[PDB]
Amino acid sequence: VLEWIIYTTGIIFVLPLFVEIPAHLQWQCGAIAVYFYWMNFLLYLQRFENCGIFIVMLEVILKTLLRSTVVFIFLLLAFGLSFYILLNLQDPFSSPLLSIIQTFSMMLGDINYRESFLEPYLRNELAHPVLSFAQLVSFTIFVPIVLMNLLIGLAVGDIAEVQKHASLKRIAMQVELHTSLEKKLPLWFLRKVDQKSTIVYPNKPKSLEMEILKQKYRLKDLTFLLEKQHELIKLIIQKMEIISETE
Amino acid sequence: VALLLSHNADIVLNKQQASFLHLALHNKRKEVVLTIIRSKRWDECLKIFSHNSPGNKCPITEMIEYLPECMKVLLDFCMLHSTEDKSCRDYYIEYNFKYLQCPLEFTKKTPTQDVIYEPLTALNAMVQNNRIELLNHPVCKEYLLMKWLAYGFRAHMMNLGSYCLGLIPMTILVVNIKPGMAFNSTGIINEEILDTTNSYLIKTCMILVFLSSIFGYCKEAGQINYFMDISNVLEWIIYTTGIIFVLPLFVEIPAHLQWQCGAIAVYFYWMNFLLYLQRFENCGIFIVMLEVILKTLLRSTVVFIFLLLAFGLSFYILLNLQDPFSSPLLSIIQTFSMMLGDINYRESFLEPYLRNELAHPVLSFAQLVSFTIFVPIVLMNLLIGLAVGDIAEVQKHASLKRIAMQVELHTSLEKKLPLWFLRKVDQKSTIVYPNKPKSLEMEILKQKYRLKDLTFLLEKQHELIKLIIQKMEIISETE
Numbered sequence A: 001v002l003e004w005i006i007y008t009t010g011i012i013f014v015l016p017l018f019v020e021i022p023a024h025l026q027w028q029c030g031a032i033a034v035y036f037y038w039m040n041f042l043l044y045l046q047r048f049e050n051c052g053i054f055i056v057m058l059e060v061i062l063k064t065l066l067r068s069t070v071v072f073i074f075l076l077l078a079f080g081l082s083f084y085i086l087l088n089l090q091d092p093f094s095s096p097l098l099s100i101i102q103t104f105s106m107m108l109g110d111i112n113y114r115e116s117f118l119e120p121y122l123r124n125e126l127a128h129p130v131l132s133f134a135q136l137v138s139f140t141i142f143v144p145i146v147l148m149n150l151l152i153g154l155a156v157g158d159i160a161e162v163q164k165h166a167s168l169k170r171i172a173m174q175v176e177l178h179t180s181l182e183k184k185l186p187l188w189f190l191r192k193v194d195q196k197s198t199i200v201y202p203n204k205p206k207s208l209e210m211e212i213l214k215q216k217y218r219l220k221d222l223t224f225l226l227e228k229q230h231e232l233i234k235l236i237i238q239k240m241e242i243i244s245e246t247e
Numbered sequence B: 001v002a003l004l005l006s007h008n009a010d011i012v013l014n015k016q017q018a019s020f021l022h023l024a025l026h027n028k029r030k031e032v033v034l035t036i037i038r039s040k041r042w043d044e045c046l047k048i049f050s051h052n053s054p055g056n057k058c059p060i061t062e063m064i065e066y067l068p069e070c071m072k073v074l075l076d077f078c079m080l081h082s083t084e085d086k087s088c089r090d091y092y093i094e095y096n097f098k099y100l101q102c103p104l105e106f107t108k109k110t111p112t113q114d115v116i117y118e119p120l121t122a123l124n125a126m127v128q129n130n131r132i133e134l135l136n137h138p139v140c141k142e143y144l145l146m147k148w149l150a151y152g153f154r155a156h157m158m159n160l161g162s163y164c165l166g167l168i169p170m171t172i173l174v175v176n177i178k179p180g181m182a183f184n185s186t187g188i189i190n191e192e193i194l195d196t197t198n199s200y201l202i203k204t205c206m207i208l209v210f211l212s213s214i215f216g217y218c219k220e221a222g223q224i225n226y227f228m229d230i231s232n233v234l235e236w237i238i239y240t241t242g243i244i245f246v247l248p249l250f251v252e253i254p255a256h257l258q259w260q261c262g263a264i265a266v267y268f269y270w271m272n273f274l275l276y277l278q279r280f281e282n283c284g285i286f287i288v289m290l291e292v293i294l295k296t297l298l299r300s301t302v303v304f305i306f307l308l309l310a311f312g313l314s315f316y317i318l319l320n321l322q323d324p325f326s327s328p329l330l331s332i333i334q335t336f337s338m339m340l341g342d343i344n345y346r347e348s349f350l351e352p353y354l355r356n357e358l359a360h361p362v363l364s365f366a367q368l369v370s371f372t373i374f375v376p377i378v379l380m381n382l383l384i385g386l387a388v389g390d391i392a393e394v395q396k397h398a399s400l401k402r403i404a405m406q407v408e409l410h411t412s413l414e415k416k417l418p419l420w421f422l423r424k425v426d427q428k429s430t431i432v433y434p435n436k437p438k439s440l441e442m443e444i445l446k447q448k449y450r451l452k453d454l455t456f457l458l459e460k461q462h463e464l465i466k467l468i469i470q471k472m473e474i475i476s477e478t479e
């Protein structure tokens, strides 16, 4: 999808090479092309080993964030549609869609307390003062504090889980890269470039489980030997001589 | 046991109504249980148990409680394949739900005098013992999916539809009329002129909100522990305010009251919608996390509301000539707003100071530093650390909790549907075409058992050796 968008818009950005075009369309396609080009460059960077674990982390966090919008987009609807009614005489809240975008922007802590709540209140320009100040407190508690801390905790967990398997995943990426490359090169070329050894001059420019497993094996061998010994002892008793100590 | 079964041995109970299978299970003898399973006569062995016994229940529940690794084999026996070729399209897997059904089926007599078995007995037994590795077995997964597609999806889409029938016309009314204007079924009163276009939609939505509020009132009076729940309070508020928002359908009302009730209704509607969403599995763990974090935050306001009092009442004295701090309550709200880092240093402290308008400069600048250290840094980092801990704790048990939610959903649904309907929609097996559209503790436990057996054998051997010494012959080596 990314590459289809890139090619379709890049072909329109430079189309006046052949056929004329309005400047507005040309630059509005350039704005999309120059953005998706550099966003798609990261998928090329994710191959190299020194900088490909960050793309894995970025993808994990982004997926986790997108799986929760199906839920936490109704908080935005609730607060935006109530702010559209309470603060309707102000320009940032003069339309349902603008009021939902302003509420999305206030999610990081940029609430505009003095400009939207205090100063209209001291001018007698709030239609519902008590409700407007109660909504401010409930919003501040619910969204910039609770929701953002929820997202931070999720990200901390995801990154810990990714770091737990960093080395193995890093090596497996390289192994898979070269394995895929081998299934497409010609035979004679692989014969030509392959080597059998290498020379290096340095001067020139999960344990506890294994232990308990081993000792389990030892214990089983011990049991086997003890049973053989018990059989031998019973044989002794049934073959011995008893004369003076008979009943 | 294999030799005694190969000959026609009887399978009876004793004085405790325990068969040999119960004795093998209570002592965790894995190999004899696997032998009983792999053999013939497994059917009668399964049927032999008896109810009315609080100690020796159905063999399946006992096997889930004591030896789950044998239940795994018993379940593996329930997946049949076709051509055994992954590529073939006629290759289909059949799942058989033979052992997950009610124990009252296995016994032929079935008196059911005082015996009442809850629905989904096997799955509830798996949940009450944290058998997560069993709940992820494909047979149990297909069992739950069959129950879902059989009646759960429908029983919950009916609930969602009944709620949206009042949720959607409310939103349609809000985003189609300008707030502050009076309106009735005839149209919008522009004060008098009367805008009459789109009156049909307005009338339809005003009727749909009224009916939903009335039916909600009736259902809630039917449910009437009640006032303790939160959903009850939310729905009472929703219905009470929604009935006032559309009241001009019958009796006139001031526009101010109408819209100030609409502002509360349209907010609590969408806030209550999340409690409906928390049922579905792909998006119900976030509501659990949200609730945990919110409870933890509310338990600390009883403490960290005195920091706000201290700082607000001192700022009310130090910066009293400025409008944001010109009253005790306004000064406490401004301090609450400054909690996220929006301090207004240049507008409240620096610029008044360079105009000689601060009454107490040194104290005013010392309070700024102590506030910045105490609240936007220490308190917020405390809250962040608490949230990180809570979310880690919730994620530790994500899969088991997710499955238990579905099991409880369907269990509750079963106790209310009619018998014949459950008979009609229930299935016994399913066919699937794929092509078509905690260990260390167990190890040390096992080796503890092995060590105890070793000790027992060694003691028997010691006794035998002492017998040898006391019976042998001694003639040439006597003293």
Ligand SMILES: O=P(O)(O)O[C@H]1[C@@H](OP(=O)(O)O)[C@@H](OP(=O)(O)O)[C@@H](OP(=O)(O)O)[C@@H](OP(=O)(O)O)[C@H]1OP(=O)(O)O
Residues within 6 Å of the ligand: B030, B446
């Ligand atoms: O009689 P088996 O079914 O073959 O199993 C027992 C043993 O059973 P316990 O776990 O109850 O002690 C282990 O079986 P698993 O846990 O692996 O199922 C063991 O495993 P290891 O060999 O890994 O130690 C090995 O069984 P298996 O060979 O199938 O792994 C062993 O039987 P044997 O030592 O006679 O093979």
Ligand SMILES: Cn1c(=O)c2c(ncn2CC(=O)Nc2nc(-c3ccc(N=[N+]=N)cc3)cs2)n(C)c1=O
Residues within 6 Å of the ligand: A045, A047, A048, A049, A050, A174, A177
């Ligand atoms: C995939 N892999 C390795 O990466 C590897 C490796 N052994 C060592 N390295 C490290 C390495 O060659 N790193 C490199 N980084 C770039 C690079 C980085 C950023 C750029 N940004 N720009 N422009 C452009 C290029 C080029 S070579 N083995 C065995 C392997 O399999």
Ligand SMILES: Cn1c(=O)c2c(ncn2CC(=O)Nc2nc(-c3ccc(N=[N+]=N)cc3)cs2)n(C)c1=O
Residues within 6 Å of the ligand: A070, B144, B145, B148, B152, B277, B279, B280, B281, B282, B406, B409
């Ligand atoms: C409770 N449960 C499952 O959920 C389940 C399941 N097996 C698969 N699922 C997933 C599922 O059906 N997900 C669904 N999601 C919606 C939905 C989501 C958001 C909405 N928002 N809006 N509007 C509205 C509807 C409908 S069905 N089993 C066995 C089960 O017991």
Ligand SMILES: *[C@@H]1O[C@H](CO)[C@@H](O[C@@H]2O[C@H](CO)[C@@H](O)[C@H](O)[C@H]2NC(C)=O)[C@H](O)[C@H]1NC(C)=O
Residues within 6 Å of the ligand: B184, B185, B186, B187, B189, B192, B193, B194, B249
């Ligand atoms: C809806 O509101 C309008 C506006 O007040 C009502 O129309 C008025 O009705 C009275 C009584 O019949 C007349 O005296 C006014 O002249 C009407 N106003 C206009 C602008 O024509 C209407 O009756 C209300 N509808 C209902 C069902 O109550």
Ligand SMILES: *[C@@H]1O[C@H](CO)[C@@H](O)[C@H](O)[C@H]1NC(C)=O
Residues within 6 Å of the ligand: B190, B191, B192, B193
């Ligand atoms: C009718 O509404 C318009 C705006 O929608 C307003 O400018 C006008 O004053 C209203 N008419 C009357 C009589 O109030």
Ligand SMILES: [Ca+2]
Residues within 6 Å of the ligand: B220, B223, B231, B232, B235
């Ligand atoms: Ca209720």
